[PDB]
């Protein structure tokens, strides 16, 4: 009785654009930014229609990686906190790439190919855009350029194996391939390169060369994209008749989580009431959520894209070399920090130790090893049963599991095997 | 429409027995050095030990163990590889039975349940056992997690420090990780079977045996039922051979159904590795499922318990011997045997990957040569043949595997 399946004949169809149901108009973002970004993708961003029609090409690719994906309820979790909640789990992790991120990314790349882009290129650090990207690369059949921050490519060589399974050419950088590149190079022949240095790279290589650049951050459109994680499980959980108290996950960027939570809170905020508890974590040694100042920010080290307004620790904030936690990202996308503003949603952090702790219990108690990022929305769990006792109800928690750990395996070895 | 799921309370609630199916009887154990059978039920669980003789065709799976199959993932969905129908010209259908759903990421978790639990119901106070790609190491740690078990896993060394994720992972579910040879491959069945004997443990195994072939064919129960809910009957059945469970599992159910009405129609095609050959080079004879020489001599394809896989092989399918009944059913060519490179085969996954998304395990790469085999002979005779595979694990931990061959 434990896994809720959706058949792949009855996945939605449209992608969820919170804009026109938030309480308070978004506050505006403040090119070149036009020639290497999809076309329709710069349209997404000010859409103004609550739903977007997912392609036909796009849903048939949505099948192809796994989706729908499962609901899975987590009994052995319940049992441990005392069946007071009932705990049901939307599983991102059983994509084909381990997570959400596959799904933002397959609308990216069509698009691309709408535009009759001759490659993509894209930045990745750990690997978890870039090995989404190759996958979405490989399933249009287009040619995909990864820029990977040199250090990380030699240190994190899974997922840059991952991305060339799947036939993505993989560039460390700062690389020769391009002039901004080649005259870091020449300052530092093996210079370890960063994320902001990395962007760059990709955006003159697409720029210079025809293609189009696929921009993995906290832009509208990209949430828009990951709603059909939340599309299905809104589906799902409306089968079973179980109607969650409480939506949680975690935040990177915050797409994950909006992707799950924004179906839900879209009914709630167009009747007037908002009657669920929305509660959103990140950690604690990047403090964004419960310690971020809101403010104009620029979305990414680059400085490419406009500032965006968030509740931001300032896009040069870099994690003390302990972390192993992967909620490395310095912002909160704009609509969730409206939310988080409004009081809507609830913000929570972490520590590595604590979130690792429970990662470690869910694994042996549930079976299924965790991403580190999605670890953080776990202790979240603890303070929910605590509520649920005093309600002499049974309240149902819904989780964005974003991810599975098994390419992080080794950020769990360097915590909890020293 | 390109994945059938069955519905978890849908499960099948039983197991396959082959034995009593069997064209002829199954050459009984040997056993010369009379010591290696008294301890062979010193180590083994006390109910798989029974089960391994076995005659009534069918067996109740447990309540406990069902429970935890739902746990980890089952029922596995069917894919239709769509895809790579077209690019080998749609010549044939091509189905996919994911055993790679599960939560460790093979089908090694659905003997690995059975053992453990049979071995707590002899009050084991831990469970031994080896192993080579850590699929199964990781699949025991687990089973041994849900079970509430101690695990201490024997790992090939080699794999130790060039897999330590998976190393990671069992230590993750809370196992103790050792490299064997050890401190008191091939190797590693004898170094497990060792630390049973003393302290007062348990040897849990992971193929080969008629006990471990009979839990792993919830996967053939499940598939069966699932091809009918499409209409869909195979042609071919294919699947690679370590041991040869996880291929048994898959077509036994459906090998007995055509043994019992008297024809067998559908052909039947295993394949393993060339760098370990014995599907192809090796002898059907009595040989030692220990390096170490241990434990009951069985009458299988072999070349040989000592044989050490080409360090330059990262394959998988390192197992020196066939597991017997395949090995009955190979001899009487009721199942057709090949043997791939792995520099042909991880070219395969390669291109399997970027077609239909998901990274096989290097060890399941070996059974889509099998699939241009059969779309190259439909093309021949015109005839659109469909083929149902043992997907038997993905490759997200050998990832090292597969760049030590593809990526210089
Ligand atoms: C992914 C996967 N697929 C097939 C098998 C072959 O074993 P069987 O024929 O099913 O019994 C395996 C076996 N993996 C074992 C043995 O390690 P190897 O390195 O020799 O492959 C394991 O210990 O994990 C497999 O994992
Ligand atoms: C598994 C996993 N979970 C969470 C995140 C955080 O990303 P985000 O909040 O932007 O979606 C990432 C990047 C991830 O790979």
Not at 188 to 208: F, M, Q, R, T
Not at 210 to 236: C, L, P
Not at 257 to 268: R, T
Request: zero cysteines; aromatic letters at 10%.
């Amino acid at each position: 009785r434990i896994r809720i399946d959706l058949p792949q004949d009855e996945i939605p169809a449209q992608w969820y654009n919170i804009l026109p149901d938030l309480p308070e108009e978004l506050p505006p973002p403040q090119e070149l930014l036009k020639e290497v970004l999809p076309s329709k993708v710069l349209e997404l961003e000010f859409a103004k229609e609550r739903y977007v029609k997912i392609p036909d090409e796009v849903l048939e690719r949505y099948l192809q990686v796994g989706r729908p994906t499962p609901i899975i309820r987590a009994k052995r979790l319940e049992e441990y906190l005392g069946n007071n909640i009932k705990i049901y789990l939307k599983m991102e992790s059983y994509t084909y790439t381990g997570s959400h991120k596959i799904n933002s990314a397959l609308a990216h790349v069509y698009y691309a190919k709408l535009d009759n882009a001759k490659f993509v290129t894209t930045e990745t650090g750990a690997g978890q855009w870039g090995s989404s990207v190759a996958l979405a690369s490989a399933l249009f059949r287009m040619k995909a350029h990864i820029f990977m921050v040199r250090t990380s490519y030699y240190a994190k060589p899974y997922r840059k194996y991952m991305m060339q399974m799947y036939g993505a050419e993989v560039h460390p950088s700062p690389s020769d391939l391009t002039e901004f590149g080649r005259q870091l190079l020449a300052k530092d022949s093996n210079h370890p390169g960063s994320l902001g240095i990395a962007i760059s790279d990709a955006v003159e290589y697409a720029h210079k060369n025809g293609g189009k650049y696929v921009v993995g951050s906290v832009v509208n459109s990209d949430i828009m994209f990951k709603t059909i994680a939340g599309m299905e499980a809104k589906k799902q959980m409306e089968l079973i008749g179980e109607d969650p108290d409480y939506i949680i996950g975690v935040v990177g960027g915050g797409s994950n989580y909006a992707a799950l939570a924004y179906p839900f809170l879209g009914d709630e905020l167009r009747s007037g009431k908002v009657r669920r508890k929305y509660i959103a974590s990140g950690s604690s040694e990047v403090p964004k959520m419960t310690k971020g100042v809101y403010k104009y920010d620029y979305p990414d080290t680059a400085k490419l894209l406009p500032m965006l307004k968030m509740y931001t620790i300032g896009s040069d904030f870099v994690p003390p070399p302990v972390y192993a936690g992967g909620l490395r990202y310095h912002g909160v996308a704009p609509t969730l920090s409206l939310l988080i503003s409004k009081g809507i949603v609830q913000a929570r952090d972490y520590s590595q130790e604590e979130s690792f702790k429970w990662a470690k219990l869910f694994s042996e108690l549930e079976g299924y090893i965790p991403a580190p990022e999605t670890s953080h929305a776990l202790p979240i769990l603890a303070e929910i049963a605590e509520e649920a006792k005093k309600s002499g109800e049974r309240k149902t928690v819904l989780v964005s599991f974003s991810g599975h750990g098994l390419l992080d395996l080794g950020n769990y070895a360097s915590v909890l095997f020293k």
